[PDB]
Design a protein around this ligand. Structure first.
Ligand SMILES: Nc1ncnc2c1ncn2[C@@H]1O[C@H](CSCC[C@H](N)C(=O)O)[C@@H](O)[C@H]1O
Ligand SMILES: Nc1ncnc2c1ncn2[C@@H]1O[C@H](CSCC[C@H](N)C(=O)O)[C@@H](O)[C@H]1O
Ligand SMILES: [Cl-]
Lengths: 447, 451
């Protein structure tokens, strides 16, 4: 430790930036977010500064550097392109004992500005002293993955709640157990972000009433189509906080390698298990006060039977939420360079499954993009019917298997070849029909 | 933000602690490790101060608070059990514009001391600012598990190499590609921790020798419909590393706070299409990392094709990260599942207005067993009501408009088809129109909020 990190309260304190270009604008925004009473000294300003000055948000002083602008200041920043000026500013502040930063130069400055993760009042700052700014960027990326946006909201609420955390919890050990289910109860977090100050109470007293070991909720989470990068932030946060993960084949191992190692896993997909057993497993492991995560390929509410799994839980009074995901259509479209819409090619995208019967004349109408989920088997009779109902036989067709994954296969061509091309693939695969499939020869950036 | 974190260089700068107990000792240890010229001024001192002064590491002043002792200082810590004394200290630091800390009063004074995770020269600082100390330790301990031990050695060796990297690579782009390869090299990390110099050099020489890609790139990122938690991991990596971010009206302020602070942002809302094409094409010419940040998914009514079509021929590398489309987002947050059993066998994503001429194929849209989702159809609600009824759709078919779906300003109004026109008047862009029997599932699956 040769830098001491301190968290400064800058609201209504005079702070000086010397320089009027892009780098000053990024430091000025930073210091404006924190409530500095800010002056900016420069030989000229990029328009964004003249805007801020008109909204009364800071003060501009045009001209050369005047060291008297430091007379009543608490922090200084050199952010010009002239090392002579920066050196003058740096030297004017050391004799006044104003902490000072030189953007150009970590050395020869009395403070360094780190990377920040803002969740006010909660804050995390990362630096390595000027040695490795990229490595701090990498740390900041990861930390932004991991901290819910609304954690600051719950941070705050914990404030005037420490009152009650003693007249209903005696030992410091149980006191921390409560605190631990507090900061992870996203139903409280969403309730606070959405100002719903009755969902907030109903969950505040459910936290003081229910036994200390009970945290029973269900979270339906979309895994996305296969690529672990295609998970959502809230999705990742949720599978970090899960007591149990109930998952099937359609969830990739890359996604499962993200699930906390000290967490129960129930494999529920197939081997070589009807819907209602899955419903009972979820119900069962939630009534035991465990935080359940149901992980499903793609998006839960698109052919995932997500609806069925949540109406089993609405009977028994079990909280739940849904974190959506990338359905296969979106992924496969993007990772094969076949946009579902483009210009006036198609007025509508149709996501269709493969009792009752499919309406055939509807599927042949022009100005559509047909996307068939679970249709490899019925693929034979699909080419027959579309031709029989008047679709042009030169209509491009594409089948995308293991979309977005490091083994993705794409097979394209023409509607007349549809039956031949469906043997060349296996589940999970997507049939895409329409004129946009011709775009892959210019847009395919994956293979 | 309520505090601005900075990292002070304390070597040879005077600081005052006032008070002399177990608290004062802890802060004094912190300031001594940071190389400060320390004065402690207290009425009595626990033994640890006595020993520190013996070895000539701080100056002791036994007596009541001496304001003049501030006159030379960069930081003051008030650390006594007397609030009256602590405030006199805070008031003397304020008149001299010296950042001051009061251990008993996080809300008074000028700076707060965070918890520290040392991986010197790597440091992570955590604080909830006094509101939550429990979450501080809970976060601090979790962070302690994520950062390896050898992260310090990698970082120390990175600074030693920083001079060589600046002479050898000319532009900013290729130093960036050097450092990205450097910090994800697990072999190079183990060789430093094992103090194996022959292996450090071998890997270092090969790295300096690799040709680096000088080209820029453009990445279409789907921002999702609004909630910042619905961005994808890949999409966070792109905007956390991007040089320029071209964004539009339909990207929320919460998503934009996730862009790298030292990147420039160009707005394209209210600008036509062929201009966006060129501004992208122009900003990628400088060989920078251009992110085009689009609400929703970029291939569902975002004209992501038009943008990338230029660059297949202009020799620019590009790729696309998909996003949560407004349909998937609004369904999950309205309680309205898009499919369900055989309520619907298919889901239609439809545009609200066509290319001037051309009529929507209402015969097709009117078909049974499908969920209908109209994008940017608000201003045409009344005609969708008419036409659908004209082409067979029943009258009591439920409908829902999800205005601003997935944000904290989300409104949802529902009804039946014959009310579609008046429902649209009490909503504003951006809104989605959902039509079909899955809308009835709302009163059982709504978990988000009663608006
Ligand atoms: N990675 C993938 N590549 C190609 N098709 C996929 C896929 N993942 C899922 N699918 C398609 O989706 C079907 C599973 S049923 C629905 C999947 C999920 N609810 C989603 O939103 O995508 C499979 O039959 C297959 O047609
Ligand atoms: N958060 C939101 N809530 C409701 N409708 C939204 C929305 N975000 C986008 N939309 C709809 O999308 C239209 C723009 S078209 C671009 C959307 C993008 N292709 C996607 O996948 O989402 C808007 O007119 C609006 O009708
Ligand atoms: Cl650094």
């Amino acid at each position: 430790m040769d830098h001491l990190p301190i968290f400064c309260q800058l609201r209504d304190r005079d702070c000086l930036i010397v320089g009027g270009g892009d780098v000053a604008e990024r430091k000025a925004r930073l210091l404006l977010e924190a409530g500095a009473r800010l002056t900016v000294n420069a030989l000229t300003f990029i328009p964004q500064f003249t805007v801020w000055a008109n909204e009364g948000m800071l003060t501009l002083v045009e001209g050369p550097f005047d060291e008297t602008l430091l007379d009543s200041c608490w922090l200084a920043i050199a952010a010009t392109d002239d090392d002579t000026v920066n050196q003058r500013v740096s030297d004017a502040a050391e004799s006044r004992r104003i902490f000072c930063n030189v953007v150009a130069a970590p050395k020869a400055a009395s403070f360094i500005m780190p990377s920040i993760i803002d969740r006010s009042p909660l804050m995390v700052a990362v630096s390595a002293g000027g040695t490795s700014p990229v490595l701090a960027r990498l740390l900041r990326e990861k930390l932004e993955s991991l901290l819910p946006q609304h954690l600051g909201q719950v941070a705050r609420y914990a404030g005037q709640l420490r009152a009650r955390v003693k007249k209903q919890f005696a030992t410091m050990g149980e006191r921390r157990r409560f605190w631990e289910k507090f900061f992870v109860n996203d139903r409280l977090a969403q309730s606070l972000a959405n100002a719903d100050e009755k969902a907030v109470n109903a969950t505040t007293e459910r936290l003081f009433s229910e036994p200390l070991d009970h945290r029973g909720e269900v979270v339906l989470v979309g895994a996305g189509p296969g690529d672990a990068g295609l998970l959502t932030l809230k999705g990742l946060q949720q599978i970090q906080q899960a007591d149990i993960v109930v998952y099937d084949r359609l969830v990739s191992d890359d996604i499962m390698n993200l699930v906390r190692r000290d967490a129960d896993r129930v494999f529920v997909g197939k081997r070589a298990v009807p819907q209602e057993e899955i419903n009972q497993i979820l119900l069962r492991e939630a009534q035991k006060g465990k935080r359940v995560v149901r992980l499903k390929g793609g998006d839960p509410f698109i052919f995932g039977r997500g609806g069925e799994e949540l109406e089993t839980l609405c009977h028994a009074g079990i909280p739940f939420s849904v974190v959506p995901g990338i359905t296969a259509a979106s992924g496969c479209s993007a990772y094969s360079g076949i946009p579902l819409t483009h210009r006036d090619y198609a007025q509508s995208v149709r996501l269709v499954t493969g009792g009752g019967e499919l309406d055939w004349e509807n599927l042949a109408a022009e100005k559509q993009t047909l996307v068939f989920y679970m249709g490899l088997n019925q693929a034979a009779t699909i080419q027959e019917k579309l031709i029989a109902f008047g679709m042009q036989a030169d209509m491009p067709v594409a089948l995308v298997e293991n979309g977005t994954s490091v083994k993705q296969r794409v097979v394209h061509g023409v509607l007349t070849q549809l039956g031949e091309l469906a043997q060349q693939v296996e589940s999970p695969a997507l049939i895409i029909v329409g004129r946009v499939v011709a775009l892959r020869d210019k847009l395919n950036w994956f293979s």
